[PDB]
Design an enzyme around this catalytic site. Structure first.
Site, short mmCIF file in Angstrom:
data_model
loop_
_atom_site.label_atom_id
_atom_site.label_comp_id
_atom_site.label_asym_id
_atom_site.label_seq_id
_atom_site.Cartn_x
_atom_site.Cartn_y
_atom_site.Cartn_z
CG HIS A 12 -2.09 -1.03 1.01
ND1 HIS A 12 -3.21 -0.97 0.08
CD2 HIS A 12 -2.19 -2.30 1.44
CE1 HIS A 12 -3.87 -1.93 0.36
NE2 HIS A 12 -3.40 -2.70 1.35
CG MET A 32 10.21 -12.78 1.72
SD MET A 32 9.99 -13.96 0.34
CE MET A 32 11.65 -14.85 0.09
CG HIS A 67 11.05 -7.17 -8.51
ND1 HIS A 67 11.00 -6.26 -7.51
CD2 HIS A 67 11.66 -8.30 -8.07
CE1 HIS A 67 11.60 -6.94 -6.50
NE2 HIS A 67 11.91 -8.10 -6.96
CG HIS A 76 11.19 -13.48 -8.65
ND1 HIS A 76 12.55 -13.97 -8.63
CD2 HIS A 76 11.13 -12.47 -7.88
CE1 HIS A 76 12.96 -13.28 -7.58
NE2 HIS A 76 12.56 -12.37 -7.42
#
Ligand code: DHE
Ligand code: DHE
Ligand code: HEC
Ligand code: HEC
Lengths: 551, 542
Positions: A53, A90, A329, A372
């Protein structure tokens, strides 16, 4: 709001969460939180919420949570939504996203208050943190140790705030060095002399591998939250500069390659590429270095812009701001080192930039959920020609994209195949020019046996006929012989010769971890690295393969 | 300093008051908010981070305390802060409102992105429906576009007959008029961020497209690189801090760039770096954007808006106005509060020089280029803070020793000068003194004879033209401002700017004789300020 396999790799701003903030006043219709209450909620917000957020609450992967929107929604609504918990972070170190009744109410109230903007971190602050332990003139002029530097592995000892330098051939730990907390990555200068590490707290250490006893020769702090660092890799610019990227503040810094002096700070605040709306928190993600021009390649996440930053003149600064895709990313260069291929993970796309011409070439959906790649895996597919591969966090798929416009134009920048590996929760895919094998981890998989194993595909057997290529399953964690817990296997990294591939067997801080070395030719266990100093081993970077971008 | 009166018409909700601070009602807070933007934000910043005035953020104001704030706002101080209370500008009640307001946390001011721009975007006459050739008998190149500031209009005035051809309604207080490279399209930008595009080829020229690009804006420019005629327009905003590249035929917003970023020298994040002057390169397909508070000059290449090439040039803080030299290669701009001229090479895209003028607060407008009889090609600026006129050499190849050095400095009428002007066909250099406190000076203009300049260190004499007296205007404060030449450079126009309920005029001077030629008066001529001749603006002839 539930824990998925591809929503655990969101930024955790736990360094920024350690900072004290003031409790704001409350407008009519809203109750103020006390000093302690506001800070308690703020700490929770930065740790287990800001990743999705934003610290400013302007929205990232999750929607905006600004006061205007939340007040219109109301406490009751927020209270009930938040009571279900948040997506876990994680393993071995993240949150589970479990809040109590006391905590649920605080978060709802916190969201109704006006958030203050966290502190900035400019030149003044960087220079105060800037320490040169060994000036350039006092350093060696040649290698003064007898180590095989190019075959050295720099291994993150995450929770110990250290790195280990390990001999690639003998597996001896040559040295354990103190660095920033939870070093995210190691990077090497183009000459292979200087080792750069960046901690999640924004601390950068520079280590001179030529010293009789290698150690930190310079350090600096570039931000409150940071994940990326890179060195200049254009021919002629070896060892000239290093660059660091931060999540907060939203900025990148170009530093002197010998001293770490901060030379140029650039804000990444700006407009989204598509809707063209101002975004006050565009985090810097992966940073690569061009081999075609004297430029750094900077992924700006929330605005979906890839920046080509020319470091030949920092005063008259030339940049190319490439409109790409939001949620950029990680990524890597193709085999020729001309094209940058990067994942806009949340949008399931691969953006391709031509670093020679400085322009977007393609944007393609992988057909998988949340690609990823890390730096990805380049290889020559028997049928398709030169390809780059990525695995996915959200599913078990491996996707191949054609990377040869000149030799294989019909395949260039198209998704040529997609096939399953061990399972979802993959983070890293790996290969090497001297290997016939493609290794795929499954780090975040919820099944212990899957997360402790690696899938290995035989590239030579690939035909690209549309069937699912078979893979061998290496029981890496089992090979390491660890009794306690359910260690996660992560990230293949080859030695300089590309004959051995290392994996981390990542267990908790007070638990037993290891590194597993696999003989690439036979796919058999070569060596198990265990040492009391090997705490929470994560990223591993071979000097030669990192300095040359060999992947 | 700027007045953000447009941003002040927005009604904001009353924020909360932290412990140890008294709150204000919605009404009280709104009254204070309007005052803040209308009278305070220019110097202090929309976000209260400081610009020409000190930062007024809550962390700093609370340490100072209410009494300190109340006292400072009441009696002001000698260092540039008005005495709001004792002058009567703000009532005693309004002073207290402002002190309380400064202790509170201000909600973020509204952004203005693509969605907002497109909502305001209106195309009255699609390109397809416009004329294919000029459909009036006007001499467009000799036409003057004149701001009627307070009336939110402009007047299109014939350069030879002095006839007001038309009075068009536009954004409030249009700041400047700019012409497309072909001379067909007239662009105006209001202080409120409203842009109007007018087609001069129409039988009865009017607005063919309009758009709003921000809350507060002062600058607009058109693409002037050969081959890019009529392709793009660019507007710059004070708030939000951004510039927008628009389609040159429809005004469609194509690329919005934030100017928020780091200061060039101390490299500290600045949340409100206002866009000042915007010029257009003649050497590359680029726009030249001054970013005031961070001290950066942006060279923005419009050949590819998706893979956007820019050059961010570290210059000097407080960049404002400027112009191109005679050759149109070098951009010379005032970093006004620091008394410097910054010189950029637009061909090579690099800073070439930063020189102090020796004067206080250089304010050149676009400046004045001329060939000085002994110094060679020079560019001149006058100053707001003193009576000086400075000349800088602009010929690195042909007069190397003189290049980018202040070659001479001499007095004109007095301080408070805004605009200096000349033309290639004129031997005269005109300098106004608009903001001077003395009416006699404020209503007059100094004229130097370039041919008589010897550059021997002595101060060149000037003739004083009594412009306001020539207009027959004494009522109110008639302030003479900005010389602008006709296409041929044989006449020079000055505005006699009086209040909206007072009589104003335009004074046309015969450049050959330096005598009064014609006085333009009309009941519609309300608060005439900027005047732009079509040919001289489209070609950057100054
Ligand atoms: C932006 C970024 C990069 C690219 C770096 C570059 O280009 O130099 C990256 C790369 C990486 C790489 C690079 C591998 C390579 O071969 O390039 C590794 C090993 C790595 C190990 C981890 N990452 Fe990473 N990672 C983040 C961000 C990033 N990680 C996060 O925001 C995140 C998700 C959580 C966080 O708050 O840091 C996160 C969690 C992790 C881990 O929990 C990992 C597995 C272990 C750890 O040590 O913390 N990240
Ligand atoms: C950024 C800027 C420019 C450059 C435009 C470009 O490159 O396109 C400019 C130019 C100008 C020019 C351009 C002259 C030229 O020949 O280029 C003129 C006539 C002008 C008349 C005025 N300006 Fe201007 N001016 C400001 C800003 C600017 N003025 C202010 O922030 C300020 C100080 C106060 C304000 O709130 O607007 C201000 C007050 C004035 C006036 O009081 C003027 C005299 C009258 C008016 O109409 O408002 N400004
Ligand atoms: C990433 C995995 C998330 C984390 C960590 C947290 N939230 Fe979230 N949130 C996320 C999503 C994908 C969504 C749905 C909307 C969308 O962007 O597609 C949400 C939604 C909320 C809401 C609902 C508001 C509404 O307008 O309906 C709230 C109140 C909210 N999130 C709060 C919140 C808090 C307090 C968190 C910390 C525990 C948090 N979220 C974590 C994604 C993610
Ligand atoms: C530009 C001409 C200004 C306008 C309009 C307003 N202010 Fe101002 N302010 C200005 C300056 C240059 C300074 C610095 C102090 C000095 O010695 O001149 C100030 C200072 C203040 C302060 C005091 C801050 C301090 O001492 O640290 C306050 C409380 C303040 N100004 C408030 C204020 C308000 C409420 C205004 C609108 C009515 C306002 N200022 C207008 C310059 C200018």
């Amino acid at each position: 709001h539930k824990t998925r396999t591809d929503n655990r790799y969101e930024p955790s701003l736990d360094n920024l969460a350690q900072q004290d903030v003031a409790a704001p006043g409350a407008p009519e219709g809203v109750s103020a939180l006390s000093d302690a209450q506001y800070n308690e909620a703020n700490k929770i917000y930065f740790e287990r919420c800001a990743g999705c957020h934003g610290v400013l609450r302007k929205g990232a992967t999750g929607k905006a949570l600004t006061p205007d929107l939340t007040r219109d929604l109301g406490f009751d609504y927020l209270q009930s939504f938040i009571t279900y918990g948040s997506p876990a972070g994680m393993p071995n170190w993240g949150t589970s996203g479990e809040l109590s009744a006391e905590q649920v109410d605080l978060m709802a109230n916190y969201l109704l208050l006006d958030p203050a903007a966290p502190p900035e971190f400019g030149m003044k602050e960087m220079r105060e943190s800037w320490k040169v332990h060994v000036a350039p003139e006092d350093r060696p002029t040649q290698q003064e140790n007898d180590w095989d530097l190019e075959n050295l592995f720099s291994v993150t000892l995450r929770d110990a705030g250290q790195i280990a330098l390990i001999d690639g051939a003998t597996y001896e730990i040559k040295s354990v060095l103190d660095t920033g907390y939870a070093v995210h990555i190691s990077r090497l200068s183009a000459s292979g002399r200087y080792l750069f590490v960046i901690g999640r707290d924004g601390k950068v250490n520079m280590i001179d591998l030529w010293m009789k006893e290698p150690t930190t020769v310079a350090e600096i702090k570039i931000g409150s939250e940071a994940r990326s660092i890179e060195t200049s890799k254009m021919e002629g610019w070896e060892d000239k500069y290093a660059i660091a990227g931060a999540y907060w503040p939203p900025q990148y810094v170009i530093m002197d390659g010998e001293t770490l002096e901060p030379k140029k700070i650039q804000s990444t605040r700006g407009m989204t590429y598509d809707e063209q709306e101002y975004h006050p928190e565009p985090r810097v993600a992966a940073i690569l270095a061009s081999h075609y021009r004297p430029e750094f390649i900077v992924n700006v996440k929330e605005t979906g812009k890839i920046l080509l930053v020319d470091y030949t003149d920092l005063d008259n600064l030339k940049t190319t701001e490439i409109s790409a895709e939001r949620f950029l990313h990680d990524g890597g260069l193709d085999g020729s080192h001309r094209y940058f291929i990067t994942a806009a993970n949340a949008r399931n796309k691969l953006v391709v930039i031509d670093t020679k011409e400085g322009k977007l070439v393609a944007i393609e959906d992988t057909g998988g959920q949340t690609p990823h790649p890390g730096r990805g895996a380049n290889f020559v597919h028997p049928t398709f020609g030169p390809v780059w591969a990525t695995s996915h966090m959200g599913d078990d798929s491996v996707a191949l994209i054609g990377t040869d416009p000149e030799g294989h134009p019909d395949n260039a920048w198209k998704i040529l195949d997609s096939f399953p590996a061990l399972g979802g929760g993959s983070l890293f895919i790996k290969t090497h020019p001297n290997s016939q094998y493609l290794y795929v981890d499954a780090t975040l998989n919820p099944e212990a046996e899957i997360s402790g194993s690696v899938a290995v595909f035989d590239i030579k057997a690939m035909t690209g006929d549309g069937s699912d290529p078979e893979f061998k399953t290496l029981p890496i964690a089992e090979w390491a012989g660890i009794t306690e817990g359910q260690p996660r296997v992560v990230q293949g990294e080859f030695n300089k010769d590309g004959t051995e591939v290392w994996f981390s067997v990542w267990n908790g801080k007070d638990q037993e971890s290891a590194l597993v070395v696999v003989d690439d030719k036979t796919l058999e266990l070569k060596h198990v690295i265990k040492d009391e100093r090997l705490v929470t081993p994560t990223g591993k970077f071979n000097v030669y393969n990192t300095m040359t971008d060999t992947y």
